[PDB]
Every structure is written in structure tokens, then in C-alpha cells.
């Protein structure tokens, strides 16, 4: 039950990174315009 838990952690890390990338891109675009 605890051997498949690392998938959820990877999913949360990837989702957080993707959201961070989208927001960072909106912020850098705001800095560029």
C-alpha cells in the first residue's frame, strides 16, 4: 500500500511545477509588457 505512494508525490510535484511555470510565465510576460 505504501509502495505506490511515490506516484502521488510525483504527481503533486509535477502539478505544482506546471502551475508555477504558468504563473511565472504570466509574471515574466507582465514584466515584458
Amino acid at each position: 500500500k505504501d509502495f505506490e505512494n511515490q506516484i502521488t508525490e510525483l504527481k503533486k510535484e509535477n502539478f505544482n511545477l506546471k502551475l508555477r511555470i504558468y504563473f511565472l510565465e504570466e509574471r515574466m510576460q507582465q514584466e515584458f509588457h
Binding site: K12, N14, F15, L19, Y22, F23, E25, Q30
Partner: protein, 797 residues
């Protein structure tokens, strides 16, 4: 920042000439979960120092620096000393670092050649620099600083600025006693002299030649306490500087209170002196009572000054000294008394910060300082700080005992500063008098109750003024319908605006349509409607979503950095929504968080519009039941295609409706019900957001692109069906060129795209298993009539 490893550790791998191996990237990962806001360096520092000196080939400088670095009393010199000792242990590690460094040193060297202590001055520079520093911290405020006249009147404290050629031994002792008493009063001797302090000093004595060698030796003990007392007066004046601090002033005043004891003993001896009944040995006996105490008092003063102790610097020095002044039980208790008193100089503000929920920062002694952070601009800003920078934490300023609770104190102070930013600034009823005491667990004991009260007050105020329950019972209608009439009017009215391209959309007409749709439903029980609106984006939901999914994956510049201006302004994908809640009134939705909560609306309403188009095509396809559809080659392959695409779109929506929706929504409800702090409510909402978008499966650029391709195929099929209907019902150019019963071929392409999408769902259920992917496979394989063939194509790898 949080990724400061990129600046330090990654450049440690690169610049250290260590590219093989892990470099300092895995080292960054190792130190990341080992980097604490506080310090927990309890270790036998004497043992580490001995090891370092033992391995010190030139141990002179090693030991000297082991003392000198403490002169500044810098931050965590023990970790650096331990590192300098343990690294000398591994010559292989040392030699390998030498390889990593000396070669780059040679490269840099080659690239280079191609193309006295005046107390007055030392204190005046300090005073001017501290005045400038207090002005900078004020950032547009005055200062109860010491006056220029305070600096003037040299020897403002009346500071310490006879022929004995053949005096009898008794007369010599008497005259020496008179000279030493004058020195103790900061006055000149009788037959000898005393040069002034050589900067940080008392009076550099110049013993009389006629002073006996035995007499000079006996006076040698006195001179230590004399220089100590003179330097002590100077240090008291130094701490009296407002630049030194109001707490430094309190310390100086407490010293002045004990200094009265010094002059008191001077007069006590002066009683016998005027009586002429004293003696050199008697004086030495009386001095021994507090001669050591003189230097003991000057010790802590020099510790503060030498460390330039501002903020919790002198506090930590004091507490450590109090923990070490044992043996000198008198100093062990006196420093405790000074600690307990001068705590209140900061502990009142600490109590103010903690209790009053408002930290007074004329000097910003409390680590929590109410950093400038406009809470209003949080909601509308993608990146916001007010929720995290309405009260910054000065980790550098913390007392010895305060540093323990500081993190917990940081949370409590953040809650209190939240209460202050809530309008209802308030004192925590727990006002356990902040003061220094031996019980360290006691400092956090009442702090625990205070923090609990702060968190509870925050929870109550959120359940009150914030009232997020209605903010969610109403937002259920937003971006999720949760009622047919919720978004029915929006779908029924935005049709013309979306038909107008994004360049062709009329914002005023849209505003009128929104206002009318707002009044067009009876679900207006929600009162938070004014907090919400509509909006638009200069890019499709895909135009930025896929750019982020391919986060420098394959279209860093091809599509992510490609402006939507390369395409045209399209009404549908360009559309967006608007909503806001005030700084105190839930500025939670920052444009990143607000965007995350918003785009679910875009995806849901995209699927809603596709289903509406399919239902409109089917409703218009009500005449074909009055005859045989066999004669509808350009209008009956539509039936087969609709059957093949309902599973792709309408059935795809049901998985989101039940499996995806119930989990995240119910998780948010239950987690918010269990939420007690702002962080707990944030976790409940973060579940509702992240896990919901996870079951929306909108973050895998390849699979999301496949689903988008299927949805676009469905949209194009609906458009071709509508065009063929327009060109056929009016037949009873471009629309007829969309299909001529070639919509059968379009339906075959849709079936192929559906097979690809089922393959993507199978890939999710195979490489990630999951339950949502297993459900996507299960919804695809409803019956083998369109799934046994899909199973065979799945085996067609």
C-alpha cells in the same frame, strides 16, 4: 530563494569544476532538507576546536581566529569551524577539492595577466553610522536620538580626562591611596599620572617612579578595576545612545543603578579615608569584595559593544553569559536580573506584538516587523506578498530564549498581524508579561496558549467577517453550474458574443448580456454575485495551458513563447471569467490562484458548448425519423458518427461529472470542515483545486493535446454537420465543401481520433494505472461493438 540551490549548489557543481559525479546538485538536495530557520548546533565545541588546532599546521592563526571571529560574534561560527576541522580530516576530499579549485585558480590567474584606536573616532563613526541606519529603518520618520549637544560637552559625564621623592612608607601608602581614590572617582593621582584611555580602555596608568616596587605591585590589582570602571562609564554612555537602542539605554540605566553602588562603596571607603583609619591591605580586602565585580560588569558591556549588539544580539549574549556566569554566583544572578528587566524593553513590544497583535517597531526589536504589503493587490496579482509579507520576520534579530519560540512565535505573530490587518486589531487576552526568566519552557508555555488563542480568533473571524461558506455556496454556481439555470443563461446569451470573434466581440454588448443573464435566473439566492464577473484572455486556454504543459518541453519558443497574435482573436477560447474578494475579505485568489480556480470554468464550459452543439444538431435531426435514414448518405453517417462521438465527448463528461467531481468537491468540503487555521483552509481549497484539476487530467501536454484534438475533431464535425445542414436545408459553397457525405470520412477520422484517445487512456491506465485512467478505459470499453475493435487496435502496437 526557495530554489537558491540553483544559484549556489548548481553553480557549486559547475564552477567547482565538478561536473562528473553528482556535483553539488545532490549536495543541494542534501542541504535542502537540512536547512533550518534556527540553529541546533549543540556540540562539544571545545572538542571541535581542539581537533582543528591539532590538524592546524600553522595553529597560531587558527587559534587566533577561533578567538577573533567571536569578536564580531558572527552568525554560527561553530558550523564553519567544524567544517574547517572535519574537511582537514579527509585528505582525499581535500586533495579532490584542491583539484576542483587550484586548476580554476590557475585559469583565473592566467586570464588576469593577459589584458590608532581613538575612543572619540570609533564612537563618532559608530554614532553617525547608527543614526544613518536608524534613519534608513525609519524610512521617513524622526528619531529620539541623542543630541548633538549630548555628543558635545566633552567628558559630559565629568570623565577621567604630589612630591613623593622621600615620603615615609606610611605616607607613601596614604598618598597612593589618595591617588587611587581620585582615579576611582576618575581623577588624577597625587605623585603618579594616568594617560587617558587608548581608545577602548579606562586610564592607561603611568605609575610614579617613587611608587615602591611593592607599592606598584599592590596598585597593579587596583588599576585593573580602575580601567574597568572608566571603560564601564564610557560603555554606559555608548549604550545611552539612542542608536545603541532604548533597550541599550535601559541596560545602561540598570548599570548606572549598580554604578551608584560603586560610588557608594567609594564613599564607604571614604568614610575611613576622611577618618584616616584605612590601610593599603585593608583597601585591598575591601576592593576584593567588588573589584572583580567591576570587571564582571564591564565584561557584558564589552560583549555588547564588541558585537555591536543590536536587537537580540546583546540579548543572546546576555542569556549565554547568564548561563555561564555560574561559579560567579553573584554575576549569575545579576545578569539574570538585568535580563529579566531589559526583556520588558523588548518584551513589552513582544507582548505588544504577541499580546497586542500590533508589534511596535520604532526600533523593530521584535523579529516580527510589519513589512509593507498592500493586501488589496493580492487578489488581482498573480504573485502576491501581503498574505506572506504583511509582517516580515527579521531572523537576525531574536533573543536567546526568544529564538526557540520565534518560529512558533512567528506563526503567532503572523496570526496577530492578521488580526491587525483584519481591521479589528486586538490584544491577545493572554498577556503573560513578556520578561526574562530562567524557565525557558515557561516562555513558550504561555506562548502556546497565546498562539492557540490567535489561531482560534483567526478561525472565528474567518467564520465571521470572511464568511467563506457563502463564498463557496455561490462559487458552486460559478465555473461549475451546480444548477442548470446557473450557466444556462450564460450559454444561451454568449452564443452571439462568441459568434463575434474575439476581435469582433462587443464588450458593451457582453456587459449587457451578463447583466441580463444575472437577472435571468431564480438561483440568485447567492449574495456574492457582485464579487464575480466575466473576463477574457488574449490566448486560448490551450494557448497558455499547453504552453505550460510543454514547459520548455517541445515548444518553449515554438508555441509557448509564440504570441497568440500569430493567430487571430477567437471569441470562444479567448473568453474568461472575473471574480475578486478584498484584501481582508479573502484576497485568496491571486491571479495565479484565481486563474487556477477560473480555468476549470473554461474547460467545463468548452465541453458544455460542444455538448450543446451536439444536442442542437440532434434536435434539428428530428425529421429523419419520419423516413428511412438510408437515403441520408450525407445526413445518416451523421447518426453513426454521433454514436461514435457521444462516447468520446458526452460520455467523457460523465467521468468528470462523477469520478472527478465528487472527489475534489467533497474533499474540499470535508477538509474545510476540519480546517481550523488559514493554512488548514488553504489545504482544503488546495485539495479542491489540485485534485480536481488532476481528475480533469488537464496537465499532461501530450494527453491533454490528444483530448483537445478529439474535442476539436468533435467541434469541427459539429461545424461540418451544421454547414452541411445549412447548405442542404437551403438546398431544399464552403459549408458544402466541408462534407458531401464525406462527413462519413470525417466521422471515420473522428473514430480514428477516438481510437487514439482510447489509446491515450489505456496509456494512462498502463503507465500510471490509477483509478481515473482505469475508469477512462472502462468507459471506453462499454461494449465490444466499439471496444473489442478498440482492444484489437490496442494490441496493434
Amino acid at each position: 530563494s526557495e530554489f537558491r540551490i540553483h544559484h549556489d549548489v548548481n553553480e557549486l557543481l559547475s564552477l567547482l569544476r565538478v561536473h562528473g559525479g553528482d556535483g553539488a546538485e545532490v549536495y543541494i538536495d542534501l542541504l535542502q532538507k537540512n536547512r533550518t530557520p534556527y540553529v541546533t548546533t549543540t556540540v562539544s565545541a571545545h572538542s571541535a576546536k581542539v581537533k582543528i588546532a591539532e590538524f592546524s599546521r600553522t595553529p597560531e592563526d587558527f587559534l587566533k581566529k577561533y578567538d577573533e571571529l567571536k569578536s564580531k560574534n558572527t552568525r554560527n561560527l561553530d558550523p564553519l569551524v567544524y567544517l574547517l576541522s572535519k574537511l582537514m580530516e579527509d585528505r582525499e576530499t581535500l586533495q579532490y577539492l584542491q583539484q576542483n579549485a587550484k586548476e580554476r585558480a590557475e585559469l583565473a590567474a592566467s586570464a588576469a595577466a593577459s589584458s590608532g584606536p581613538t575612543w572619540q573616532q570609533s564612537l563618532e563613526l559608530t554614532r553617525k553610522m547608527l543614526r544613518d541606519k536608524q534613519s534608513k529603518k525609519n524610512s521617513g520618520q524622526r528619531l529620539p536620538v541623542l543630541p548633538a549637544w549630548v555628543y558635545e560637552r566633552p567628558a559630559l559625564l565629568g570623565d577621567f580626562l604630589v612630591p613623593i621623592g622621600s615620603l615615609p612608607l606610611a605616607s607613601q601608602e596614604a598618598a597612593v591611596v589618595e591617588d587611587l581614590l581620585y582615579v576611582l572617582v576618575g581623577v588624577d593621582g597625587r605623585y603618579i599620572s594616568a594617560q587617558p584611555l587608548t581608545g577602548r580602555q579606562g586610564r592607561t596608568f603611568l605609575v610614579d617612579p617613587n611608587l615602591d616596587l611593592s607599592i606598584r605591585e599592590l596598585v597593579s590589582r587596583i588599576l585593573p578595576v580602575a580601567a574597568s570602571y572608566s571603560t564601564v562609564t564610557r560603555f554606559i554612555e555608548e549604550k545611552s545612545s539612542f542608536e545603541y537602542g532604548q533597550v541599550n539605554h535601559a541596560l545602561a540605566a540598570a548599570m548606572r543603578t549598580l554604578v551608584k553602588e560603586y560610588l557608594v562603596l567609594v564613599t564607604q571607603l571614604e568614610q575611613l579615608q576622611r577618618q584616616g583609619l584605612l590601610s593599603l591591605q585593608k583597601l585591598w580586602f575591601y576592593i576584593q569584595p567588588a573589584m572583580r565585580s567591576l570587571d564582571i560588569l564591564a565584561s557584558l558591556a564589552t560583549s555588547v559593544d564588541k558585537g555591536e549588539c543590536i536587537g537580540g544580539a546583546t540579548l543572546s549574549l546576555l542569556h549565554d553569559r547568564s548561563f555561564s556566569y555560574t561559579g560567579d554566583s553573584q554575576a549569575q544572578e545579576l545578569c539574570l536580573h538585568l535580563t529579566k528587566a531589559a526583556s520588558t524593553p523588548y518584551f513589552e513590544i513582544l507582548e505588544k506584538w504577541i499580546y497586542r497583535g500590533i508589534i511596535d517597531d520604532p526600533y523593530s526589536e521584535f523579529m516580527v516587523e510589519e513589512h509593507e504589503l498592500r493586501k488589496e493587490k493580492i487578489q488581482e496579482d498573480y504573485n502576491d506578498k501581503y498574505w506572506d509579507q504583511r509582517y516580515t520576520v527579521v531572523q537576525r534579530q531574536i533573543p536567546s530564549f526568544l529564538q526557540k519560540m520565534a518560529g512558533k512565535v512567528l506563526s503567532t505573530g503572523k496570526y496577530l498581524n492578521v488580526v491587525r490587518e483584519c481591521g479589528h486589531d486586538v490584544t491577545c487576552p493572554v498577556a503573560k508579561e513578556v520578561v526574562y526568566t530562567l524557565k525557558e519552557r515557561a516562555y513558550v508555555e504561555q506562548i502556546e496558549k497565546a498562539f492557540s488563542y490567535a489561531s482560534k480568533v483567526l478561525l472565528d473571524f474567518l467564520m465571521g467577517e470572511k464568511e467563506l461558506l457563502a463564498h463557496l455556496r455561490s462559487i458552486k454556481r460559478y465555473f461549475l453550474m451546480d444548477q442548470g439555470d446557473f450557466f444556462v443563461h450564460f450559454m444561451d446569451l454568449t452564443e452571439e458574443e462568441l459568434k463575434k470573434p474575439v476581435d469582433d466581440i462587443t464588450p458593451t454588448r457582453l456587459e449587457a448580456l451578463l447583466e441580463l443573464a444575472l437577472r435571468m435566473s431564480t438561483a440568485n439566492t447567492d449574495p456574492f454575485k457582485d464579487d464575480l464577473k466575466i473576463d477574457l484572455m488574449p490566448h486560448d486556454l490551450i494557448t497558455q495551458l499547453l504552453r505550460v504543459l510543454a514547459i520548455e518541453t517541445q515548444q518553449e519558443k515554438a508555441m509557448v513563447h509564440a504570441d497568440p497574435t500569430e493567430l487571430t482573436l477567437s471569441g470562444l477560447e479567448a473568453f474568461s471569467f472575473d471574480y475578486v474578494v478584498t484584501w481582508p475579505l479573502s484576497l485568496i485568489i491571486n491571479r495565479k490562484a484565481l486563474t487556477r480556480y477560473q480555468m476549470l470554468f473554461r474547460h467545463m464550459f468548452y465541453c458544455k458548448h460542444v455538448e450543446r452543439q451536439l444536442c442542437s444538431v440532434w434536435i434539428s435531426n428530428k425529421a429523419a425519423k419520419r423516413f428511412s435514414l438510408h437515403s441520408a448518405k450525407w445526413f445518416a453517417g451523421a447518426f453513426t458518427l454521433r454514436q461514435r462521438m457521444l462516447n468520446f465527448v458526452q460520455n467523457i463528461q460523465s467521468y468528470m461529472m462523477f469520478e472527478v467531481m465528487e472527489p475534489t468537491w467533497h474533499v474540499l468540503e470535508q477538509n474545510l470542515r476540519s480546517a481550523s487555521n488559514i493554512d488548514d483552509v488553504l489545504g482544503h481549497h488546495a485539495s479542491f483545486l489540485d485534485n480536481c484539476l488532476k481528475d480533469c487530467m488537464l496537465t499532461n501536454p501530450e494527453l491533454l493535446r490528444v483530448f483537445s484534438k478529439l474535442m476539436s475533431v468533435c467541434v469541427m464535425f459539429t461545424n461540418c454537420l451544421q454547414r452541411f445542414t445549412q447548405s442542404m436545408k437551403l438546398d431544399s459553397p464552403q459549408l458544402a465543401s466541408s462534407f458531401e457525405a464525406t462527413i462519413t470520412k470525417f466521422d471515420k477520422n473522428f473514430s480514428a481520433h477516438l481510437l487514439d484517445l482510447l489509446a491515450r487512456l489505456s496509456i494512462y491506465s498502463t503507465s500510471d494505472c490509477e483509478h481515473g485512467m482505469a475508469s477512462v478505459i472502462s468507459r471506453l470499453d462499454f461494449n465490444g461493438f466499439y471496444t473489442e475493435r478498440l482492444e484489437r487496435l490496442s494490441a496493434e502496437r
